[PDB]
Amino acid sequence: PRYLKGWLKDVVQLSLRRPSFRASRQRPIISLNERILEFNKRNITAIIAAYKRKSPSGLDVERDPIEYSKFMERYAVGLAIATEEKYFNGSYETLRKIASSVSIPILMWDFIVKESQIDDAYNLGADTVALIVKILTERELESLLEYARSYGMEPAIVINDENDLDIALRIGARFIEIASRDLETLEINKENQRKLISMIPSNVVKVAWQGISERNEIEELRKLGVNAFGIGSSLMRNPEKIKEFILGS
């Protein structure tokens, strides 16, 4: 991983030590970026709903993850399931159970720093993973992206500034998450997010993530070329808000 400080250094150290999940996958791979483009062609707003029991940007939410994921199967283009243990209060078992219960694409959200965690995502049933530019060197990013694609996954490459975007293009990202929250300070900068979105080539599948809370914002971002919208805490609180994000109120 890159030289890191503070909580990022801590979470990367923890992830390096994460024991692997050693069972065979029992689920097809279903492409999250292809389904996003299908929604686009169908003029259906594409929301990637996240399940996260906690995050550094929100309070813990104790809801049944299965009931949540079955509800979202009706509406969302894909689910993102936060599996990191210390800061997201996640578990591989929650991912495994959700993947066993739903037939929409699933992204495993965690801090992926070694190949065995991509083996884990595949074996647990996730269709794809995020890879985070801020924590991985270019060589690790390239290696892990190639590794994930050898399983038939197309990872979301997470960026939050111009440096990250330059590295995403350099490693041949096809599917970019433009995160409006800086991982290190937790600050949201939407002006920067919109600038980055305007700099991405039109053939890359773009997900705007973090701080999206209104149908109007989604409509604005769609007009700038964004393909899909990742939304976590507002849906962890009120899953039915997803109906207004897709259909208006």
- Contact status: 155 vs ligand 3NY (CB under 6 A): no
Residue of 22, 50, 31, 45 lying closest to 230 (CA atoms)? 50
What are the counts of helices (DSSP H) followed by strands (DSSP E) for the chain? 11, 8
Task: Tell me what percent of the chain is helix, strand and coil, each rounded to the nearest 5.
Answer: 40, 15, 40
Structure tokens at 141: 């990013």
- Contact status: 206 vs ligand 3NY (CB under 6 A): no
Q: Least separation, in Å, of the C-beta of 157 and ligand 3NY?
A: 11
End-to-end, the C-alpha distance of the chain in Å comes to: 44
Residue with smaller CB distance to ligand 3NY, 1 or 232: 232
How many angstroms separate the CA atoms of 183 and 160, rounded?
Answer: 8
- Contact status: 104 vs ligand 3NY (CB under 6 A): no
Structure tokens at 99: 């993947």
Q: Find the part of the chain contacting ligand 3NY (CB under 6 A) among 10-18, 38-46, 77-85, 98-106.
A: 77-85
* String marking each residue 83-102 x if it binds ligand 3NY according to CB under 6 A: --------------------
Give the CB-side neighbour count of residue 163, counting CA atoms within 13 A.
8
User: Is there a contact between 208 and 232 (Cβ–Cβ < 8 Å)?
Assistant: no
Which residue do the tokens 């996260």 mark? 52
- Contact status: 82 vs ligand 3NY (CB under 6 A): yes
- Contact status: 11 vs ligand 3NY (CB under 6 A): no
- Contact status: 52 vs ligand 3NY (CB under 6 A): yes
Q: Find the part of the chain contacting ligand 3NY (CB under 6 A) among 17-25, 27-35, 75-83, 186-194.
A: 75-83
Q: Find the part of the chain contacting ligand 3NY (CB under 6 A) among 50-58, 91-99, 116-124, 145-153.
A: 50-58
Contacting positions for ligand 3NY (CB under 6 A)? 50, 52, 55, 80-82, 109, 158, 177, 179, 209-210, 230, 232
